């Protein structure tokens, strides 16, 4: 379902540049996304919490070193 490739070009929507996401690459309107650019590569995924995290996993560590 969400396993696809596409090609496209930048366009202008309002006073902002935008990019279209064809069906199998889109996320749906109700999902908050994180958008990170590294150099010229843009990575987009649902926002589920930053890496600083979740009490940075102060759960209780297993005894064996990994």
């Amino acid at each position: 379902h969400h396993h696809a490739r596409a090609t496209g070009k930048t366009f202008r929507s309002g006073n902002s540049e935008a990019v279209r996401l064809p069906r199998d690459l889109a996320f749906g309107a109700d999902v908050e996304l994180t958008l990170i650019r590294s150099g010229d590569v843009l990575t987009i995924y649902p926002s589920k919490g930053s890496i600083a995290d979740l009490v940075a996993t102060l759960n209780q560590m297993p005894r064996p070193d990994s």
Binding site: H3, I36, V41, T43, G49, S50, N59, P62
Partner: protein, 127 residues
């Protein structure tokens, strides 16, 4: 973006301090391979006594991290690795994950960089 090798991710799960700090210093998106998740899930149930903890600490990682599935584009890259480097039984699963990094133009983060210098085009961070 960054893709963690499985051992880096295992060192994130079981709370290794010298990796956890290095991972937060990363200023890019941190992606987990579905393949690493498979290896991680199996590791939960390796030793029954740590399973409760490892189950809990993995479930937290999977709540947060975005997962890269293994799809046709990654398999295409895997094929290109074998065409250039030759088949290697030992490095099949490692190449599968690196192939995902390549498809998504992401830096591969690993403790085992030497095993990956035969992959044309791969960006590597050796830890």
């Amino acid at each position: 973006a960054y893709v963690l090798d499985t051992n880096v991710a295992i060192h994130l799960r079981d709370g290794d301090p010298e990796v956890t700090t290095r991972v937060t210093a990363l200023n890019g998106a941190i992606l987990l391979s579905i393949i690493s998740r498979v290896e991680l899930e199996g590791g939960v149930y390796r030793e029954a006594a740590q399973a409760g903890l490892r189950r809990s600490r993995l479930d937290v990682m999977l709540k947060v991290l975005p997962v890269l599935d293994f799809d046709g584009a990654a398999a295409d890259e895997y094929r290109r690795i074998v065409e250039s480097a030759g088949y290697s039984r030992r490095k099949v699963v490692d190449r599968m994950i690196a192939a995902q990094a390549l498809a998504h133009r992401a830096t591969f983060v690993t403790f085992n960089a030497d095993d990956f210098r035969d992959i044309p085009g791969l960006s590597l961070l050796a830890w």
